[PDB]
Design a binder for this molecule. Structure first.
Ligand SMILES: [Ca+2]
Ligand SMILES: [Ca+2]
Length: 134
């Protein structure tokens, strides 16, 4: 068994998602199509949100698993405003290494730019210390 440790650090270059505002940005993490979803806090009225939030997701397969990262803009009614997403194959991360990297998000229809998000990702055997080289 292996575990995927993910620090959702920050994002930048976000589009304007509110006609009289900026972006009320939060991120969502999903392994494969698992119903166990992880969400950051919202950072209100910014194009450069910093969350620095850690999540720990059990992996079912260290090669075929995929991490989908959704970026969204929180709005005032019952729904939010999708911005962009990226699908990150898990096989590209060397086992036990802590990889700090920026990822260009692909914007949804009707959004001019998708932004970039910084993630620290670390696949490690269960019980090993998160975010330390193994
Ligand atoms: Ca909006
Ligand atoms: Ca908003």
């Amino acid at each position: 068994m292996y575990q995927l440790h993910v620090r959702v650090v920050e994002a930048k270059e976000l589009p304007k998602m509110d006609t009289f505002g900026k972006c009320d940005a939060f991120a969502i993490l999903q392994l494969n199509s698992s119903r166990n979803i992880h969400r950051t806090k919202v950072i209100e009225k910014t194009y450069t949100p910093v969350w620095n939030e850690e999540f720990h997701i059990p992996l079912e397969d260290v090669t075929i698993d995929t991490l989908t990262v959704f970026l969204k803009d929180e709005d005032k009614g019952s729904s939010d405003d999708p911005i962009s997403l990226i699908k990150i194959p898990i096989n590209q991360f060397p086992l036990g290494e802590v990889v700090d990297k920026w990822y260009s998000l692909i914007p949804v229809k009707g959004v001019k730019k998708g932004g970039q998000i910084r993630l620290t990702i670390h696949i490690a055997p269960l019980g090993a210390t998160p975010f330390q080289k193994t």
